[PDB]
Amino acid sequence: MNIFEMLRIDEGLRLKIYKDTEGYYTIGIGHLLTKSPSLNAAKSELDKAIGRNTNGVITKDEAEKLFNQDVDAAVRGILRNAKLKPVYDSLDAVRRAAAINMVFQMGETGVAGFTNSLRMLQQKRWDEAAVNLAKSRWYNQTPNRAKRVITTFRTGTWDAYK
Ligand SMILES: [Cl-]
Ligand SMILES: [Cl-]
């Protein structure tokens, strides 16, 4: 198991524009297009992302190409962020994957809001960080996904994904 397989499980794959769990136009493997309520706005963001006239539909290669860019962008967003980077550097490889999953889903700024959790993660107080991570809109809106990521942070294993 690795970050790509983890995110592929949590996000799924859809080859046509769909609304994510918040109601936002999305495509592929969790690639958010726009928060605007306009499907035309989504279609135009999509053509721009892919570099051709898609009419709301993409291929698997194309979905997987966006996914690669989004994973890379998430990693690079952690390393450039002064609150996230030291926590990430402190973590082992499995728990690093959990951090990237979070940034991927909610963005670098959203995760950097988990100040107390981030500090407990840096100190390797895993049960405590797991409890605190769950006191969140994130956990309450997407509890099954949030439970899998939390378990990953708690145990440093892939058990929640097997
Ligand atoms: Cl893009
Ligand atoms: Cl969920």
Swiss-Prot record:
Keywords, comma-separated and alphabetical: Antimicrobial, Bacteriolytic enzyme, Cytolysis, Glycosidase, Host cell lysis by virus, Host cytoplasm, Hydrolase, Viral release from host cell
Coiled-coil regions listed in the entry: none
Cell location: Host cytoplasm
Mutation effect (residue 26 to H): Facilitates transglycosylation more effectively than hydrolysis; covalently bound substrate
UniProt-reported outcome of changing residue 11 to Q: Complete loss of activity
Induction / repression: Expressed late in the viral replication.
Record SUPFAM superfamilies: Lysozyme-like (SSF53955)
Known outcome of mutating residue 26 to E: Complete loss of activity at neutral pH; covalently bound substrate
GO terms for MF: lysozyme activity
Family from the record: Belongs to the glycosyl hydrolase 24 family.
Protein name (database record): Endolysin
Organism: Enterobacteria phage T4
Gene responsible for this protein: E
